[PDB]
Amino acid sequence: GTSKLKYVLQDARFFLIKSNNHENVSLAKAKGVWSTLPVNEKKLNLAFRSARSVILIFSVRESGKFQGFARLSSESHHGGIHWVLPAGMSAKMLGGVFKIDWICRRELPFTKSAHLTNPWNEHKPVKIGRDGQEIELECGTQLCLLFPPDESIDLYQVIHKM
Numbered sequence: 413g414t415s416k417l418k419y420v421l422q423d424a425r426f427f428l429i430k431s432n433n434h435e436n437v438s439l440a441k442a443k444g445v446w447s448t449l450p451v452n453e454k455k456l457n458l459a460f461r462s463a464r465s466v467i468l469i470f471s472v473r474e475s476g477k478f479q480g481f482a483r484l485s486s487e488s489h490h491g492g493i494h495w496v497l498p499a500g501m502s503a504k505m506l507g508g509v510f511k512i513d514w515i516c517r518r519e520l521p522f523t524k525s526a527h528l529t530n531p532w533n534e535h536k537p538v539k540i541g542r543d544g545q546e547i548e549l550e551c552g553t554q555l556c557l558l559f560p561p562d563e564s565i566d567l568y569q570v571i572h573k574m
């Protein structure tokens with residue numbers, strides 16, 4: 413069913429994550445971590461304190477799809493990842509590491525979200541946006557509800573993290 417999912421998305425904040433390659437998203441799905449540039453890292457830490465759930469919605473550039481969505485379980489932390497680094501990039505830029513809990517690891521093609529526009533990006537289709545773009549509540553909720561159900565995930569523990 414979808415009731416626990418709707419509860420998790422209740423009053424959540426949503427951010428679009430644009431990865432340059434699939435390898436990093438695969439690594440994030442295996443290890444439950446994400447890293448972004450310093451500008452987006454600061455925005456996500458602020459949002460984590462402000463909302464009962466912060467949702468990251470992933471899209472690999474040129475894939476034409478979203479690859480799933482996850483909930484932040486922590487602010488970024490350093491010390492204690494073999495990211496594939498794009499042109500330029502640098503390991504120090506990706507140094508902050510967030511822990512995340514996947515809510516859906518299934519794909520959604522951009523063709524299925526063409527009816528959703530994001531007020532925080534000039535009402536462009538939600539697939540359009542740079543890495544870190546915030547997605548307004550209603551559009552974010554409807555976008556997440558479009559993904560195929562991921563029956564391998566139990567949201568009971570996620571609800572407890574809240």
Ligand SMILES: CNc1nc(Cl)nc2c1ncn2Cc1ccccc1
Pocket residue numbers: 430431432433436446447448449495496497498499501506543
């Ligand atoms: C592990 N995190 C990441 N991995 C990859 Cl391959 N691309 C990312 C990324 N975070 C943001 N981008 C997009 C971008 C923005 C600016 C210059 C190069 C690439």
